[PDB]
Structures are given as C-alpha cells and as structure tokens.
Design an enzyme around this catalytic site. Structure first.
Site, PDB file in Angstrom:
ATOM      1  N   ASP A 136      45.258  -8.204  27.868  1.00  0.00           N
ATOM      2  CA  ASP A 136      43.960  -8.769  28.346  1.00  0.00           C
ATOM      3  C   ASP A 136      42.797  -7.897  27.873  1.00  0.00           C
ATOM      4  O   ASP A 136      41.835  -7.736  28.636  1.00  0.00           O
ATOM      5  CB  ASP A 136      43.939  -8.922  29.869  1.00  0.00           C
ATOM      6  N   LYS A 138      39.463  -7.301  26.259  1.00  0.00           N
ATOM      7  CA  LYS A 138      38.255  -8.135  26.057  1.00  0.00           C
ATOM      8  C   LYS A 138      37.048  -7.383  26.608  1.00  0.00           C
ATOM      9  O   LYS A 138      37.206  -6.419  27.362  1.00  0.00           O
ATOM     10  CB  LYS A 138      38.439  -9.507  26.712  1.00  0.00           C
ATOM     11  N   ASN A 141      36.581  -6.419  30.287  1.00  0.00           N
ATOM     12  CA  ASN A 141      37.591  -5.441  30.777  1.00  0.00           C
ATOM     13  C   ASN A 141      37.376  -4.071  30.122  1.00  0.00           C
ATOM     14  O   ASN A 141      38.259  -3.197  30.270  1.00  0.00           O
ATOM     15  CB  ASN A 141      39.011  -5.935  30.512  1.00  0.00           C
ATOM     16  N   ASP A 158      41.419  -3.446  34.250  1.00  0.00           N
ATOM     17  CA  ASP A 158      42.145  -4.716  34.531  1.00  0.00           C
ATOM     18  C   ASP A 158      43.524  -4.677  33.856  1.00  0.00           C
ATOM     19  O   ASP A 158      43.703  -5.354  32.813  1.00  0.00           O
ATOM     20  CB  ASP A 158      41.317  -5.931  34.103  1.00  0.00           C
ATOM     21  N   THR A 175      42.682 -14.463  27.091  1.00  0.00           N
ATOM     22  CA  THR A 175      41.469 -15.274  26.826  1.00  0.00           C
ATOM     23  C   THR A 175      41.544 -15.803  25.399  1.00  0.00           C
ATOM     24  O   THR A 175      41.667 -15.022  24.461  1.00  0.00           O
ATOM     25  CB  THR A 175      40.200 -14.450  27.063  1.00  0.00           C
TER      26      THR A 175
HETATM   27  N1  LIG Z   1      37.562  -3.895  33.866  1.00  0.00           N
HETATM   28  C1  LIG Z   1      37.415  -4.882  34.465  1.00  0.00           C
HETATM   29  C2  LIG Z   1      37.272  -6.115  35.248  1.00  0.00           C
HETATM   30  C3  LIG Z   1      37.232  -5.802  36.738  1.00  0.00           C
HETATM   31  C4  LIG Z   1      37.002  -7.069  37.586  1.00  0.00           C
HETATM   32  C5  LIG Z   1      38.193  -8.046  37.631  1.00  0.00           C
HETATM   33  C6  LIG Z   1      38.911  -7.768  38.958  1.00  0.00           C
HETATM   34  C7  LIG Z   1      38.047  -6.844  39.762  1.00  0.00           C
HETATM   35  C8  LIG Z   1      36.703  -6.805  39.074  1.00  0.00           C
HETATM   36  N2  LIG Z   1      36.237  -4.752  37.008  1.00  0.00           N
HETATM   37  C9  LIG Z   1      36.441  -3.439  37.192  1.00  0.00           C
HETATM   38  C10 LIG Z   1      35.214  -2.871  37.430  1.00  0.00           C
HETATM   39  C11 LIG Z   1      34.883  -1.464  37.662  1.00  0.00           C
HETATM   40  N3  LIG Z   1      33.572  -1.150  37.653  1.00  0.00           N
HETATM   41  C12 LIG Z   1      33.215   0.132  37.832  1.00  0.00           C
HETATM   42  N4  LIG Z   1      34.021   1.178  38.023  1.00  0.00           N
HETATM   43  C13 LIG Z   1      35.326   0.862  38.014  1.00  0.00           C
HETATM   44  N5  LIG Z   1      36.378   1.713  38.176  1.00  0.00           N
HETATM   45  C14 LIG Z   1      37.537   0.974  38.110  1.00  0.00           C
HETATM   46  C15 LIG Z   1      37.251  -0.339  37.911  1.00  0.00           C
HETATM   47  C16 LIG Z   1      35.827  -0.440  37.848  1.00  0.00           C
HETATM   48  C17 LIG Z   1      34.290  -3.926  37.349  1.00  0.00           C
HETATM   49  N6  LIG Z   1      34.915  -5.064  37.097  1.00  0.00           N
END
Ligand SMILES: N#CC[C@H](C1CCCC1)n1cc(-c2ncnc3[nH]ccc23)cn1
Ligand SMILES: N#CC[C@H](C1CCCC1)n1cc(-c2ncnc3[nH]ccc23)cn1
Lengths: 273, 266
Positions: A136, A138, A141, A158, A175
């Site tokens: 995954d 992308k 992520n 992710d 995706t």
């Molecule tokens: N990578 C990715 C995608 C994931 C989303 C998808 C499921 C939960 C939110 N996500 C993780 C974060 C994130 N933001 C900031 N600090 C972080 N630390 C660990 C994950 C994380 C934001 N979105």
C-alpha cells in the site's frame, strides 16, 4: 472522543489526547501529549469490532510494526489492547502526508525528488531484507518529517496490508494508480510490487500526474495501461528532466519482474547517489 | 445506474455491512430472482480508491454449495455483482432462532460446507472467513436445507505459507494467531468450530469479557471441552470428528476429503 470511542482510563491517565490528524476506516490518528514528559506523540485508535453488530475482527498491522525500526518508517512506541479497540502510541510526524504536499506544490526539483525516493527506497530495502512487502505504498501513506535544517525526510506508515512473503501471493489489493501489473494479472507477486509503487510516486513527483491514467469510458483502461506498462515522458512536462531520472523510473516500472530494479539497485542508481 | 435499472427491478436490502449491500432484484425479461451486491470502492467520502479481491475468486468457482456469480457491471463509483439468490437468510440468524440442531441436520450442514471447502482446496483457494454470518441457508421444495458459502472478500490462492493475521477470533486457527505460517486447513478449523456450535449452541473456545487472551490461549492449546449436560446426548462419532477438525497440529488435522470420508457425515 469526538467519534465516541470510550478512551481507557489507563490511556487518559498517561496521555492528554488532542485533535484528529488522520482519518481512515476502523482507524483514527490523534495528536496527544504524554503528561509526565510533555512530549508530543501520535495515538492511532483501531476498532477491532466492525461496529456492524458484534462483528469482532483481527488486525495484522501491529504484528509488523513490532518487528521493524527505521528512520524512514513510522515508529511504534507502545500498544494498549482493549476489548473494543487497539490503541497504538507512535512517534508524531507534523509535516502532513506526501499527497497533501503534491497537491500544494504541483512538481518537485530532481534534487528534492531523488531525496524522497532515497528515503522511500531505504524504507523498502529494510522491509525487503526482512521479507516484508508493504502492498500500500502511496502518497497518502508517506509522512513528511521536517528537520530544523530545513530538509524534509519521508516516513512510511499504514502497515494495514503489510505481510511476510514466503512464495508467490495472489490477494488483489492496493490503490489502482500505484498497483503493479502482476497483481492485476493474478500470476503471483512478491516484494517488487513496492518498487513499482515507488516508481509511480517518483514519476508523479517530477511532472505532477501519474504515468498510467484511467479514462471516463471505464476502469478497465487504467488496468490495460498498467498491464502494457509503456511509461511515456511527454513534452513539454518532461523536456527539462534529466535522462538519468527517466532511465531509473523506467527500470522501476518494468512488467518483467526479474528485470525490474530491487530497492538495492534503485539506491545504487546515480540519480539517488 | 440506468444500465442496471433497465434490466433489473432492485427490491429490498437482505444483506448489509461495511462498504457493501446485498439487495433482492428481479430480471424483468425473465422474472428471475437474483441477489444484487453493490460494493462501494472509494468508501472515503473523497477521491480515495481501493481494488476488490472477492470478484477474482467468484469468477473461478462454480459449486452447488458456493454462491454463483451471474454477471458484474463495473461503474466508476461502485461495483455491481448479480449473484444466485438464497432466501433462507444466514446460518448465524438460523442458530439464534434454533438454540441447537439434531446430529442428522448438523452432519447434513457439515456435508455441504466440507464439499464447498473440498472444491476450493482442489483449486488451492483458502476462504479465511468461514463463519455462520458467511453461510446461507438454501431452502429446498421438499423443505430440506443446504448451506451455501457467500463472501470471498478474504479468499486467496495459496502457494506457500501465508502470514496475514485476519478472520473472526471465535473461528480463527491457532497457526494464524501464532504467526508461524498457515494454508488451506485454517478452513477445516473454522468448520470444526461451526459444527461444535450447531450441536450445543455455544463455541468450543469462549472468551472472558475481562481478558480475550483466555480465548486465544484456549485456541493456541486447542482446549476443546464437551461439557455436560450440553453434550450428554451427542454421539462419540460427532465428538471424535470435531476432535480431528480442531487439532493444533496442521499435519494431523483432517483435510476436507477426510471430513467427507468420516462415517458421521456419511
Ligand atoms: N500513513 C498513513 C495513513 C494514516 C491514516 C489511515 C489510518 C489512520 C490515519 N495516517 C497516519 C498518520 C500519522 N500522522 C502523524 N503522525 C503519525 N505517526 C504515526 C502515524 C501518523 C496520518 N494518517
Ligand atoms: N454470506 C455472506 C455475507 C454477506 C454480507 C456481507 C457483505 C454483504 C452482506 N451476505 C450475502 C448475502 C446473500 N444473501 C442472499 N442471497 C445471496 N446471494 C449472494 C449473496 C447473498 C447476505 N449477506
């Protein structure tokens, strides 16, 4: 919380839970401050129950996150399993995701692009050395870590679809924009689907649009392009990009999986130094 | 969509869930009743997009104890699957209406499920989500009843050990929890758990609301009880088969063939 998770007293005791910074299906990510140290962390809350009746299901992400540490991968600090939800405390990354950054600045310089690929190809080499495929990779992520220097590193997150490869896999997932032909072809795939994804991201960084774009006719068009896998570098968009970059992207986006660069070969390429 | 509205009179919802709804439909030209599965791909109130695995498998499989795919219409928003209609609801609902079944009815239902599994395993396909909610009750004209396996969301072809931790805790095999590598025989374990519930009305591995690790340790050790008075009436045959289906040793555990060759299902 806003969504209505009953936050365990164990969590609330140690951590002050802040605003939501990431939203998915059966998962939310929040800012949170550890009360003792005043240090900022990411709190990822994963719903085990589907909340569609008592349809309790099991999670795979944490099996992977426990056995990995890398500067260019999101770091699991600790975990709290509650009957309802799995709570992951992780290192906080404040620069948002790569998707947001691409929509803000259409394109990137080769210098900035190679640096980001160097980070991503580093993460992938590490995972691949442990026979872990991400599946995954992308922009949504990839998290942007801003240094005080002004420089920016990528951190991969992710690991929801991440698994161990011990022979060919067939599960159709990812995706479409970033998915390797061998996944669509259903002829079996391994670690190198991650290299394909990275190639697509690198292409997007340099010109601001993907190499394989669907049509308003049908979705079979996108899949037909990926299976064919003819990477074009159209004018004027690619006129002022080096041949070296175009060479590397080509070697990452080959349908022939034995000819497609490994992460080691990407990292040994002159364009990433 | 227009293209689907034309051919089909879409009736009520008969199956709901995450990212998916199953509705009764009738083909207007033939007056033939079908199930319409509508799979939303984006599911992110945004531009986010994901691929569907269930459909690759459904295309490969034809069996009287497996739900039949009739046709697929891929609209850019959602995927539409026309499938054989089973009107008898899911086995979960059936078990919650009837506390427990007779041995004869249970062996009948295991015959259907072990037949489905044997077919899938002969094509090197592991289902990985075998549970009452995913088993449909086909009601015969005689009033006799068959099982049909429905949702292939987590189904894949197996060419070596798998490691993805997935499924429902109650029905999940120990090798999945142990993260040591798993294959086709995770489906036999699931089938064993279902058979056990069919005879007594409760699962063989039961969790504490306080600690779910009690559930997983039971699974990991294969701690199958046959408690009184619940299992007083049930034959040694049923107990012996369930025993061979719920073995922690994957090599000793019965195949689908061995389940079918057991006197209790004959
Ligand atoms: N990578 C990715 C995608 C994931 C989303 C998808 C499921 C939960 C939110 N996500 C993780 C974060 C994130 N933001 C900031 N600090 C972080 N630390 C660990 C994950 C994380 C934001 N979105
Ligand atoms: N099996 C299973 C689970 C599945 C639900 C989970 C995803 C959509 C609803 N489901 C399918 C049905 C169903 N019911 C009746 N006839 C059918 N034909 C094909 C599927 C189907 C009902 N629920």
């Amino acid at each position: 919380s806003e969504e209505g998770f009953q936050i365990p007293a164990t969590i609330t005791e140690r951590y002050k839970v802040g605003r939501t910074i990431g939203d998915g299906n059966f998962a939310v990510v929040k800012e949170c401050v550890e009360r003792s140290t005043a240090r900022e962390y990411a709190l990822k809350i994963i719903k085990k129950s589907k909340c569609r009746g008592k349809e309790h299901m099991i999670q795979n992400e944490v099996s992977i996150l426990r056995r990995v540490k890398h500067p260019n991968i999101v770091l699991l600090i600790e975990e709290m399993d509650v009957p309802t939800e799995l709570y992951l405390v992780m290192e906080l990354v404040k620069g948002g995701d790569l998707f947001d950054a691409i929509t803000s600045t259409n394109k990137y310089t080769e210098r900035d692009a190679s640096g980001m690929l160097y980070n991503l190809a580093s993460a992938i080499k590490y995972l691949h050395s442990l026979n872990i495929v991400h599946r995954d990779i992308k922009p949504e992520n990839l998290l942007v870590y801003e240094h005080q220097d002004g420089s920016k590193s990528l951190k991969l997150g992710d690991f929801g679809l991440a698994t161990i490869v011990d022979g060919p896999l067939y599960t159709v997932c990812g995706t479409p924009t970033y998915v390797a032909p061998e996944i669509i072809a259903e002829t079996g795939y391994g670690l190198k689907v991650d290299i394909w994804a990275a190639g697509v991201i690198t292409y997007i960084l340099l010109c601001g649009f993907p190499p394989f774009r669907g049509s308003g006719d049908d979705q079979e068009v996108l899949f037909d392009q990926i299976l064919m896998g003819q990477v074009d570098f159209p004018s004027p968009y690619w006129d002022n990009v080096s041949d070296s970059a175009k060479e590397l992207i080509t070697m990452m986006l080959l349908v022939d999986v034995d000819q497609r660069f490994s992460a080691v070969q990407v990292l040994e390429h002159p364009w990433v130094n």
